[PDB]
Amino acid sequence: PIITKCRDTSGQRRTNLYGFIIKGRSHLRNDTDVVNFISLEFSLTDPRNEIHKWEKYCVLEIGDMEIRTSISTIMKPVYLYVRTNGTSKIKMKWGMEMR
Amino acid sequence: LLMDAMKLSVLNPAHEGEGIPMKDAKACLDTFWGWKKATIIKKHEKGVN
Amino acid sequence: MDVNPMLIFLKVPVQNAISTTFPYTGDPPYSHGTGTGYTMDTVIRTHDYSSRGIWKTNSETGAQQLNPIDGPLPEDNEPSGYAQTDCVLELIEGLDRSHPGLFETACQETIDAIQQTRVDKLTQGRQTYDWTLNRNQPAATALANTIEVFRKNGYKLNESGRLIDFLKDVLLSFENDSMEVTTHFQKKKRIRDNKKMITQRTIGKKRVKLTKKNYLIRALTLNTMTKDAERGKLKRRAIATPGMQIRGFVYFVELLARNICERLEQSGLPVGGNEKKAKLANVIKKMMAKSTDEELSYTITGDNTKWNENQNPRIFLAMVLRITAGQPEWFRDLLAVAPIMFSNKVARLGRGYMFESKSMHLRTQISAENLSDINLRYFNEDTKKKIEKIRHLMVEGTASLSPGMMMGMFNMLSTVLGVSVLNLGQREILKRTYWWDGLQSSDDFALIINGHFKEDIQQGVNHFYRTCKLVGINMSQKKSYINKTGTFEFTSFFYRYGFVANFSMELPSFGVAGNNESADMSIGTTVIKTNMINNDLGPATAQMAIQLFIKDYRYTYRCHRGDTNLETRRTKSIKRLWTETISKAGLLVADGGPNPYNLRNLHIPEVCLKWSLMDPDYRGRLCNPNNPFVHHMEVESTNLAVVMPGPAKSLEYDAVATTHSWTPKRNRSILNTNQRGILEDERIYQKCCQVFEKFFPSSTYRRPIGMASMLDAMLSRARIDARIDLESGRISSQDFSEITNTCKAIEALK
Amino acid sequence: PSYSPTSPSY
RNA sequence: AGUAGUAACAAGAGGG
RNA sequence: UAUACCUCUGCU
Ligand SMILES: [Zn+2]
């Protein structure tokens, strides 16, 4: 699962979930050897408004969300951006060090 | 996803990397209802959708 | 508003905000697959730059060798390698005049070295190409392999122990026309098991004789591969590895060039970063002092294009012979060996290529040796052309490569050529309206040109540029540039009326080094420390760099603080230690303890820093000298790691030997190959060396010298130690007979 | 604005 | 498909 | 030839 943890300005600690990643096989020998994965990530972005951005993705509509605002609850559809992707031991190493 | 990402979340006293990932993940899914039957709204042109 | 970081340069000078132009927090480029494409590119291009020279077939190898030196003078600005012997010797003579007694003492120090140097010295350093196996191997195994095969044939001068005798054996080995080598190969035996019969892979050895060509080709062979992780370049490039035959000669030539460079103001090598800056500061100081107020100063931020490909082994032979003038002729001829082998060098073409069939869905590997005879229908248009050009140079799998050099072959003597062109710029030699000085380290240079008017600078540049062409040096017109003296760049140091910080260069050194828990903590805190001093890492960011390192260290080694709610494979055992411990502050970070570090104590090793605050029993376990985790190495390789900024140097760190000073598991891929036996050799050699150290404790500190046998040395010690321990000591009379009976029993077994 | 597309109040 | 990028990965080898 | 397994390897 794609998770992060954080604290608000108000101080409350919180766990967020963005989506999921399904790891393929990973007999990674060379530092460039590839792991195939599938990322399934939530979004409210309509992909058709900028379809060139999403060449590699297959976007699903998976739900409806009642979103609270100032003084009006809004109804927006919930998309799921699915795609096959890949990474390597070296690329993962440098991702772990992004701090 | 960068700017286009969307989060399901829970209030949770846990620290910056605490708890079992899939247990936390299910906790986040249970906050959201109104899942639909899934439908393709934008195809991956080169792939079996 | 669209955000653009480049607009910061409107207010902030580019040198002062240079960190924003170094993208060194992302993974650098890696080559995937073979470097044969690049090795051929290099070999083809090397010959193109020398193409107007003189082709001649070699008497001993049959390799087709291009000689461009003393050739036709170039008529364009393209990369040329038509170095002129007389122009080189003039510059080297100029260098001798300007530094009287330098060549003398440089040679005198190199003489003393050659006498004192042992065969041991080639166990040190990077991987060498092994002619025994046609592969890269660690230095010491390539040495032991060459000594074994030399010993098996008629060559044992190196039995003395001195290196010059091993070097004799190498030159004497070219005369053999039937050199014998034991190869290894897999055998599929069948044995019964309890009640079915299963197939079994085993390995047996077979002797093979080699031609006079075959052996000679292999001794002049230098391996090739692609350079990985290289910053600042779109395209990959090929690098090379010297073989065992040439290496000991190269050691002594580079040693001479080092002793020369050590006493040359204009050489950046072999000094470190801060001293390079001091040296550059001196020439700017010296150029300004010696000019008048009427005169100008411009500085070339300088790069030499195609540096290695146009530096010729024949020119290196001219240099070495001129530098050694008037010294003993044995010493001249010894140092002359390396340039000669470089002139007749041959390059292995690499792994080869991989082919793919879309319709059949299969893949196949072909060797680079097959490039001579294979059909060209498989290849793309560019690769096919390269194979056709390479076929003309091809010699028994390898490709001949007389002219030029390749990266990772040879070091400091090429800087001496550059420095001699810098030395030509003195007022007292040129006597013109212009004059120059500067600093050089390999292909990079900073040149300062002074003159009375801007026209004099132009004439000065052309004189420098054209003189450099006459010795096979090609200044890049694309990458070099000129401006009034006051700002320049040199090996990613940026001067702006003084050297400024380039912290982003160092960003890849901020992390968990991956040696072990002990070494990494020391290394990590010292990286922060040395950057505060050397690269303007401010105190707040340095505090945060401690914080982030501790996070990275805790996650990587799964050693989170003992009072954490996290769950890893180690949390339970660390929790047991946490609750058991009275003084928690004394626990190391690797044992779940708190971080002690802040700015003031980065230079203090962790165990030392926490020693007062440790529980007695924990400390006594932690630093227990009887623990099974440490590798009791030699003194010379104690507290050394390896780092890459240069080639690949060693980093010494400060740490107390503990249970955290452990070593990770060895790679186990060798178990599937024919070289499987090498593991057993090592296991046997280690037990033999382990037992010797029980008779000679000081062998772990100082390498013992002796032409005598290892068993015989141990036996001599076995007797006499038993003697003094009884004669005047605390050993019984019955035990002295028990030890000498065993020594006599061992003496009987031979 | 009215809401957050990245951390929406639901 | 996807990673990727001047050539590879998308397991290799063996029980044949 | 296919499908199951089994063994070694993950910088060599
Ligand atoms: Zn932590």
Short mmCIF file of N, CA and C in Angstrom, two decimals, chain A:
data_model
loop_
_atom_site.label_atom_id
_atom_site.label_comp_id
_atom_site.label_asym_id
_atom_site.label_seq_id
_atom_site.Cartn_x
_atom_site.Cartn_y
_atom_site.Cartn_z
N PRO A 1 0.83 -1.19 0.00
CA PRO A 1 0.00 0.00 0.00
C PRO A 1 0.87 1.24 0.00
N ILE A 2 0.45 2.27 -0.72
CA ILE A 2 1.15 3.55 -0.75
C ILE A 2 0.68 4.35 0.48
N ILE A 3 1.52 4.40 1.51
CA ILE A 3 1.20 5.08 2.78
C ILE A 3 2.15 6.26 3.02
N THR A 4 1.64 7.31 3.66
CA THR A 4 2.46 8.26 4.40
C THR A 4 1.80 8.57 5.73
N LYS A 5 2.61 9.01 6.69
CA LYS A 5 2.14 9.46 8.00
C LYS A 5 2.52 10.93 8.11
N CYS A 6 1.71 11.71 8.81
CA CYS A 6 2.02 13.12 9.06
C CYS A 6 1.23 13.67 10.23
N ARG A 7 1.61 14.86 10.66
CA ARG A 7 0.95 15.61 11.72
C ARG A 7 0.40 16.89 11.07
N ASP A 8 -0.75 17.37 11.53
CA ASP A 8 -1.33 18.64 11.04
C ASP A 8 -0.58 19.85 11.63
N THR A 9 -0.96 21.05 11.21
CA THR A 9 -0.61 22.26 11.96
C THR A 9 -1.31 22.24 13.33
N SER A 10 -2.54 21.71 13.35
CA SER A 10 -3.31 21.50 14.58
C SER A 10 -2.76 20.42 15.53
N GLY A 11 -1.79 19.63 15.09
CA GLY A 11 -1.06 18.69 15.96
C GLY A 11 -1.45 17.23 15.83
N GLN A 12 -2.60 16.95 15.20
CA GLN A 12 -3.14 15.59 15.11
C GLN A 12 -2.34 14.71 14.13
N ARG A 13 -1.91 13.55 14.60
CA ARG A 13 -1.20 12.59 13.75
C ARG A 13 -2.19 11.81 12.88
N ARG A 14 -1.79 11.51 11.65
CA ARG A 14 -2.69 11.01 10.61
C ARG A 14 -1.99 10.02 9.69
N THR A 15 -2.71 8.99 9.25
CA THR A 15 -2.22 8.02 8.27
C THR A 15 -3.00 8.17 6.95
N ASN A 16 -2.28 8.40 5.86
CA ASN A 16 -2.87 8.60 4.53
C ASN A 16 -2.61 7.38 3.65
N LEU A 17 -3.57 7.05 2.79
CA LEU A 17 -3.45 5.96 1.82
C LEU A 17 -3.74 6.53 0.44
N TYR A 18 -2.78 6.40 -0.48
CA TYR A 18 -2.89 6.96 -1.83
C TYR A 18 -3.34 5.94 -2.87
N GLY A 19 -3.22 4.65 -2.55
CA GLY A 19 -3.38 3.59 -3.53
C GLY A 19 -2.56 2.36 -3.18
N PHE A 20 -2.31 1.52 -4.17
CA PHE A 20 -1.57 0.28 -3.98
C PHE A 20 -0.58 0.06 -5.11
N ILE A 21 0.44 -0.74 -4.81
CA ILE A 21 1.43 -1.18 -5.78
C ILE A 21 1.51 -2.70 -5.69
N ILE A 22 1.47 -3.37 -6.84
CA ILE A 22 1.59 -4.82 -6.92
C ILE A 22 2.94 -5.14 -7.55
N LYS A 23 3.84 -5.68 -6.74
CA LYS A 23 5.20 -6.00 -7.17
C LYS A 23 5.16 -7.25 -8.02
N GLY A 24 5.83 -7.23 -9.18
CA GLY A 24 6.04 -8.44 -9.96
C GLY A 24 7.11 -9.33 -9.34
N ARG A 25 7.68 -10.22 -10.15
CA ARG A 25 8.86 -10.99 -9.74
C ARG A 25 10.07 -10.07 -9.72
N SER A 26 11.06 -10.43 -8.92
CA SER A 26 12.15 -9.52 -8.59
C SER A 26 13.44 -10.28 -8.35
N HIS A 27 13.84 -11.09 -9.32
CA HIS A 27 15.14 -11.77 -9.27
C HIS A 27 16.19 -10.79 -9.77
N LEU A 28 16.45 -9.77 -8.97
CA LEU A 28 17.28 -8.65 -9.38
C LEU A 28 18.74 -8.93 -9.08
N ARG A 29 19.52 -9.14 -10.13
CA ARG A 29 20.94 -9.43 -10.02
C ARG A 29 21.73 -8.14 -10.29
N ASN A 30 21.81 -7.71 -11.55
CA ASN A 30 22.46 -6.43 -11.89
C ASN A 30 21.71 -5.27 -11.24
N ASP A 31 22.44 -4.19 -11.00
CA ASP A 31 21.86 -2.98 -10.42
C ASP A 31 20.85 -2.27 -11.35
N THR A 32 20.90 -2.54 -12.66
CA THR A 32 19.90 -2.05 -13.62
C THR A 32 18.73 -3.01 -13.89
N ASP A 33 18.84 -4.27 -13.48
CA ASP A 33 17.75 -5.25 -13.65
C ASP A 33 16.42 -4.67 -13.17
N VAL A 34 15.36 -4.96 -13.92
CA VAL A 34 14.06 -4.33 -13.70
C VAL A 34 13.13 -5.19 -12.84
N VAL A 35 12.37 -4.53 -11.97
CA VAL A 35 11.18 -5.12 -11.34
C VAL A 35 9.99 -4.48 -12.03
N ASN A 36 9.07 -5.29 -12.53
CA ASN A 36 7.81 -4.76 -13.03
C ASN A 36 6.85 -4.64 -11.86
N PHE A 37 6.16 -3.50 -11.76
CA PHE A 37 5.05 -3.38 -10.83
C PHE A 37 3.85 -2.72 -11.50
N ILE A 38 2.72 -2.79 -10.82
CA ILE A 38 1.49 -2.12 -11.22
C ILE A 38 1.13 -1.16 -10.10
N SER A 39 0.91 0.11 -10.44
CA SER A 39 0.49 1.12 -9.48
C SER A 39 -0.99 1.42 -9.70
N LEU A 40 -1.77 1.42 -8.62
CA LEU A 40 -3.20 1.73 -8.69
C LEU A 40 -3.49 2.87 -7.73
N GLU A 41 -3.57 4.08 -8.26
CA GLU A 41 -3.53 5.28 -7.44
C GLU A 41 -4.80 6.11 -7.57
N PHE A 42 -5.33 6.55 -6.43
CA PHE A 42 -6.54 7.35 -6.39
C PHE A 42 -6.30 8.73 -6.97
N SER A 43 -7.35 9.33 -7.52
CA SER A 43 -7.32 10.71 -8.01
C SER A 43 -8.73 11.25 -8.23
N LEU A 44 -8.86 12.57 -8.13
CA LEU A 44 -10.06 13.29 -8.56
C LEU A 44 -9.85 13.95 -9.92
N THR A 45 -8.66 13.81 -10.50
CA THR A 45 -8.35 14.44 -11.77
C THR A 45 -9.01 13.68 -12.91
N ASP A 46 -9.74 14.42 -13.74
CA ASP A 46 -10.31 13.88 -14.97
C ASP A 46 -9.17 13.77 -15.99
N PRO A 47 -8.83 12.54 -16.43
CA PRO A 47 -7.71 12.40 -17.36
C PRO A 47 -7.96 12.95 -18.77
N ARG A 48 -9.23 13.08 -19.17
CA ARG A 48 -9.58 13.53 -20.51
C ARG A 48 -9.26 15.01 -20.75
N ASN A 49 -9.18 15.80 -19.68
CA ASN A 49 -8.81 17.23 -19.78
C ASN A 49 -7.34 17.48 -20.14
N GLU A 50 -6.52 16.43 -20.10
CA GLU A 50 -5.09 16.54 -20.40
C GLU A 50 -4.57 15.14 -20.73
N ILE A 51 -5.18 14.53 -21.75
CA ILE A 51 -4.99 13.10 -22.08
C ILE A 51 -3.56 12.72 -22.50
N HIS A 52 -2.82 13.68 -23.05
CA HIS A 52 -1.39 13.51 -23.36
C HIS A 52 -0.51 13.23 -22.12
N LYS A 53 -0.90 13.77 -20.96
CA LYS A 53 -0.23 13.47 -19.68
C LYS A 53 -0.25 11.99 -19.29
N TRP A 54 -1.28 11.25 -19.73
CA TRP A 54 -1.58 9.93 -19.20
C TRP A 54 -1.38 8.76 -20.17
N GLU A 55 -0.59 8.96 -21.23
CA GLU A 55 -0.31 7.94 -22.27
C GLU A 55 -0.18 6.52 -21.73
N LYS A 56 0.54 6.35 -20.62
CA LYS A 56 0.89 5.02 -20.10
C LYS A 56 -0.17 4.42 -19.16
N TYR A 57 -1.15 5.24 -18.78
CA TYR A 57 -2.15 4.87 -17.78
C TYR A 57 -3.46 4.37 -18.39
N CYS A 58 -4.12 3.47 -17.67
CA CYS A 58 -5.53 3.12 -17.91
C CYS A 58 -6.33 3.60 -16.72
N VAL A 59 -7.12 4.66 -16.90
CA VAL A 59 -7.83 5.29 -15.79
C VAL A 59 -9.24 4.73 -15.65
N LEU A 60 -9.57 4.28 -14.44
CA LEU A 60 -10.90 3.77 -14.11
C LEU A 60 -11.67 4.82 -13.33
N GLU A 61 -13.00 4.72 -13.35
CA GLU A 61 -13.88 5.46 -12.44
C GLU A 61 -14.40 4.42 -11.45
N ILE A 62 -13.97 4.53 -10.19
CA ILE A 62 -14.23 3.49 -9.18
C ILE A 62 -15.18 3.89 -8.05
N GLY A 63 -15.62 5.15 -8.01
CA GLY A 63 -16.48 5.60 -6.92
C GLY A 63 -17.00 7.02 -7.02
N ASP A 64 -17.78 7.41 -6.01
CA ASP A 64 -18.28 8.77 -5.85
C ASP A 64 -18.03 9.20 -4.41
N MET A 65 -17.59 10.45 -4.23
CA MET A 65 -17.24 10.98 -2.92
C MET A 65 -18.02 12.25 -2.66
N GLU A 66 -18.65 12.33 -1.48
CA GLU A 66 -19.27 13.56 -1.00
C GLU A 66 -18.20 14.38 -0.28
N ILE A 67 -17.83 15.51 -0.89
CA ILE A 67 -16.76 16.37 -0.38
C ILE A 67 -17.35 17.62 0.28
N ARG A 68 -16.89 17.92 1.49
CA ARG A 68 -17.41 19.04 2.28
C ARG A 68 -16.60 20.29 1.95
N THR A 69 -17.27 21.44 1.86
CA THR A 69 -16.62 22.73 1.54
C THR A 69 -17.05 23.80 2.57
N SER A 70 -17.15 25.07 2.16
CA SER A 70 -17.61 26.14 3.04
C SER A 70 -19.02 25.87 3.58
N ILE A 71 -20.04 25.95 2.71
CA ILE A 71 -21.44 25.70 3.10
C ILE A 71 -22.16 24.95 1.96
N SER A 72 -21.52 23.91 1.42
CA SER A 72 -22.12 23.09 0.36
C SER A 72 -21.34 21.79 0.13
N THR A 73 -22.01 20.66 0.33
CA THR A 73 -21.41 19.35 0.02
C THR A 73 -21.45 19.12 -1.50
N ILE A 74 -20.27 18.84 -2.07
CA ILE A 74 -20.09 18.62 -3.51
C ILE A 74 -19.87 17.13 -3.77
N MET A 75 -20.39 16.65 -4.90
CA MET A 75 -20.27 15.26 -5.33
C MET A 75 -19.29 15.22 -6.50
N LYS A 76 -18.19 14.49 -6.33
CA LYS A 76 -17.16 14.33 -7.36
C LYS A 76 -16.90 12.84 -7.59
N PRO A 77 -16.65 12.43 -8.85
CA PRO A 77 -16.26 11.05 -9.10
C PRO A 77 -14.80 10.80 -8.74
N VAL A 78 -14.52 9.56 -8.34
CA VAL A 78 -13.22 9.14 -7.84
C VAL A 78 -12.62 8.22 -8.89
N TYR A 79 -11.48 8.64 -9.44
CA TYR A 79 -10.78 7.85 -10.45
C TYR A 79 -9.67 7.00 -9.83
N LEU A 80 -9.24 6.00 -10.58
CA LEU A 80 -8.12 5.14 -10.20
C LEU A 80 -7.17 5.04 -11.38
N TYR A 81 -6.01 5.68 -11.25
CA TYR A 81 -5.03 5.70 -12.32
C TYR A 81 -4.20 4.44 -12.21
N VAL A 82 -4.43 3.50 -13.14
CA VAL A 82 -3.71 2.22 -13.18
C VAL A 82 -2.67 2.25 -14.30
N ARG A 83 -1.51 1.66 -14.04
CA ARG A 83 -0.48 1.51 -15.05
C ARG A 83 0.53 0.46 -14.65
N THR A 84 1.16 -0.14 -15.65
CA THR A 84 2.34 -0.97 -15.42
C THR A 84 3.54 -0.03 -15.40
N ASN A 85 4.51 -0.33 -14.53
CA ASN A 85 5.72 0.49 -14.39
C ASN A 85 6.88 -0.40 -13.97
N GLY A 86 8.07 0.19 -13.87
CA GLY A 86 9.27 -0.57 -13.55
C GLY A 86 10.34 0.25 -12.85
N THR A 87 11.15 -0.44 -12.05
CA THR A 87 12.28 0.18 -11.37
C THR A 87 13.40 -0.85 -11.15
N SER A 88 14.53 -0.38 -10.64
CA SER A 88 15.72 -1.20 -10.45
C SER A 88 16.32 -1.00 -9.06
N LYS A 89 17.24 -1.89 -8.68
CA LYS A 89 17.94 -1.79 -7.39
C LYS A 89 18.61 -0.43 -7.22
N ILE A 90 19.32 0.04 -8.25
CA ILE A 90 19.97 1.35 -8.18
C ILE A 90 18.94 2.48 -8.07
N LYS A 91 17.86 2.42 -8.86
CA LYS A 91 16.87 3.49 -8.82
C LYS A 91 16.15 3.51 -7.47
N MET A 92 15.85 2.32 -6.94
CA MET A 92 15.27 2.20 -5.60
C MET A 92 16.20 2.73 -4.49
N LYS A 93 17.49 2.43 -4.59
CA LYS A 93 18.48 2.93 -3.64
C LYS A 93 18.39 4.45 -3.55
N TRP A 94 18.45 5.12 -4.70
CA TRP A 94 18.43 6.59 -4.72
C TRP A 94 17.08 7.20 -4.30
N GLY A 95 16.01 6.43 -4.48
CA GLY A 95 14.69 6.83 -4.00
C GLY A 95 14.60 6.76 -2.49
N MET A 96 15.21 5.72 -1.91
CA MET A 96 15.31 5.59 -0.45
C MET A 96 16.08 6.74 0.19
N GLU A 97 17.02 7.33 -0.56
CA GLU A 97 17.86 8.42 -0.08
C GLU A 97 17.36 9.83 -0.40
N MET A 98 16.10 9.99 -0.81
CA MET A 98 15.62 11.29 -1.35
C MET A 98 15.60 12.45 -0.34
N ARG A 99 15.66 12.12 0.96
CA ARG A 99 15.76 13.14 2.00
C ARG A 99 16.99 14.06 1.89
#
